[PDB]
Amino acid sequence: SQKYLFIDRDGTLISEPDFQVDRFDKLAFEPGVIPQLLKLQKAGYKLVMITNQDGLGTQSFPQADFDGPHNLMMQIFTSQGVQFDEVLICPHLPADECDCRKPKVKLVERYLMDRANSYVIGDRATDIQLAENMGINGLRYDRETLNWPMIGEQLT
Amino acid sequence: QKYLFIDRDGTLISEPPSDFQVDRFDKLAFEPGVIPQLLKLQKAGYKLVMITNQDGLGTQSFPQADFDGPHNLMMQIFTSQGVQFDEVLICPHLPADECDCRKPKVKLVERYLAEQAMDRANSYVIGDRATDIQLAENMGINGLRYDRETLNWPMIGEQLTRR
Numbered sequence A: 001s002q003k004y005l006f007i008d009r010d011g012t013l014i015s016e017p018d019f020q021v022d023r024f025d026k027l028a029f030e031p032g033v034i035p036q037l038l039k040l041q042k043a044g045y046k047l048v049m050i051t052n053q054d055g056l057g058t059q060s061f062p063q064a065d066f067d068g069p070h071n072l073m074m075q076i077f078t079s080q081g082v083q084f085d086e087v088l089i090c091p092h093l094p095a096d097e098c099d100c101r102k103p104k105v106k107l108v109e110r111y112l113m114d115r116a117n118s119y120v121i122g123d124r125a126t127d128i129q130l131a132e133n134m135g136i137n138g139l140r141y142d143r144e145t146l147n148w149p150m151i152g153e154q155l156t
Numbered sequence B: 001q002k003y004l005f006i007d008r009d010g011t012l013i014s015e016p017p018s019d020f021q022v023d024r025f026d027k028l029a030f031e032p033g034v035i036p037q038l039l040k041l042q043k044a045g046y047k048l049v050m051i052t053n054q055d056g057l058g059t060q061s062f063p064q065a066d067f068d069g070p071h072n073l074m075m076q077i078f079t080s081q082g083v084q085f086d087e088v089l090i091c092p093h094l095p096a097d098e099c100d101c102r103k104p105k106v107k108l109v110e111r112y113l114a115e116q117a118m119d120r121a122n123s124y125v126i127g128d129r130a131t132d133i134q135l136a137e138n139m140g141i142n143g144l145r146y147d148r149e150t151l152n153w154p155m156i157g158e159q160l161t162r163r
């Protein structure tokens, strides 16, 4: 029974801008995310990224626009020793009414792990609802009030 | 006070082998472990100073705007992760400019060379080229020649916190 952290991307690992990181100059890391995720890995947590990317692939959010910043974000995490077991993406618009948009559990169905010691960490109510739907704990990330240093201390 | 004077290109981030300049985001790549290891060094009491030769920066050969995107992102990553450079010292000159500030000349770091400005015995230049090592000699401090395999960030982190 592995301990997992299911971590939101936009607004949680990196800053959330039109709400899409579609340019290199819109990429910024959240404070302390690297050293704290390293700390959490050391304590035995495995990391899984799970993200809604509204309209990824469309005129308003071309795949290539997402790829640049995302791949770089991944370069930085990986070179610093932070590893994500999977990066799980829902590219759909809300109007699409798809199977995979958080807080639906589709993307994570295979994990449904040590439930008592697993968490979804994200900055929206839907991340917390995903945790409920998965039967695990939820941590509502907030840069000011419940941030990476706080989570790193709490969970270790 | 112990200081680490650290090169950028090839040391904190990789050096593009074509023109040796990070002038696009697709040419930006962090060296392994640089973030946790600089945090470790800071926690042991080191202050950090960046010192970099950026040949032709601010001219058509390397436009300021082109340097800024990747450099500012790099700095944002460092700052947001808790890595603080006291100063970022830049020589923008071409070798043929014969300027006063190009490493291994000491002009950029002259303030650190004042009588009681730093602990010379326990301060280092860290860089991947002979000019960084010569800078150290000219400053009267130690030099570490960065090598991704044989003298890397984890090794430096360990070596400089040894007691």
Ligand SMILES: [Ca+2]
Pocket: A008, A009, A010, A011, A012, A016, A122, A123, A124
């Ligand atoms: Ca979010």
Ligand SMILES: [Ca+2]
Pocket: B007, B008, B009, B010, B011, B015, B127, B128, B129
């Ligand atoms: Ca260099």
Ligand SMILES: [Ca+2]
Pocket: B009, B015, B020, B021, B022, B053, B054, B055
């Ligand atoms: Ca260079």
Ligand SMILES: [Zn+2]
Pocket: A090, A091, A092, A098, A099, A100, A101
């Ligand atoms: Zn979907």
Ligand SMILES: [Zn+2]
Pocket: B091, B092, B093, B099, B100, B101, B102
């Ligand atoms: Zn110069």
